[PDB]
Amino acid sequence: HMNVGEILRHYAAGKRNFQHINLQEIELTNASLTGADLSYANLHHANLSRANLRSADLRNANLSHANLSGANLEEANLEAANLRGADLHEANLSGADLQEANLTQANLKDANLSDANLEQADLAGADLQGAVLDGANLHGANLNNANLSEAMLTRANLEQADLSGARTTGARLDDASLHGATVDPVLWRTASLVGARVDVDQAVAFAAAHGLCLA
Secondary structure, three states: OOOHHHHHHHHHOOOOEOOOOEOOOOEOOOOEOOOOEOOOOEOOOOEOOOOEOOOOEOOOOEOOOOEOOOOEOOOOEOOOOEOOOOEOOOOEOOOOEOOOOEOOOOEOOOOEOOOOEOOOOEOOOOEOOOOEOOOOEOOOOEOOOOEOOOOEOOOOEOOOOEOOOOEOOOOEOOOOEOOOOEOOHHHHHHOEOOOOEOOHHHHHHHHHHOOOOOO
């Protein structure tokens, strides 16, 4: 286990390789750790509020129940990271690699996930209310019971994603790629879908969700 003073000093000296390090419960509010290699680090229940982690390597890091509120994670590598129950509200994750990341139960309210890679990410039960996911890749992502209320998913790739139980009141799915996704009928009636790309099965489902039958 390394403490605050240690890591700040090391970072200030130009050290960047902190891979595998145990930093459980650490208080690093307002800390700047841009470009740090924290791959495989244990940051369970850490306070990283307003931390600058721009371009950090956090691949496979344990960030479960961590406070990342307002953190900068632009272009960060978070592939396969454990973010379950983490607070990411208002974080900037623009262009971040979150593929295969575990975001179950995460608070992503008002988060910026623009152009982020969320391929195969597990976001089940996560709260994305008012979040921004413009141009993001959610191919094969799990959005079971997620809150997408007023989320912007414009031009996002939702191919093969699972939106079963997701709240989509006010959600904006304009130009999103929906091919192969799993959705509830209520999505068709709640999301904006101008330009949204769909399969024939889905087109039929959109119609059925508007009351049309079929003989």
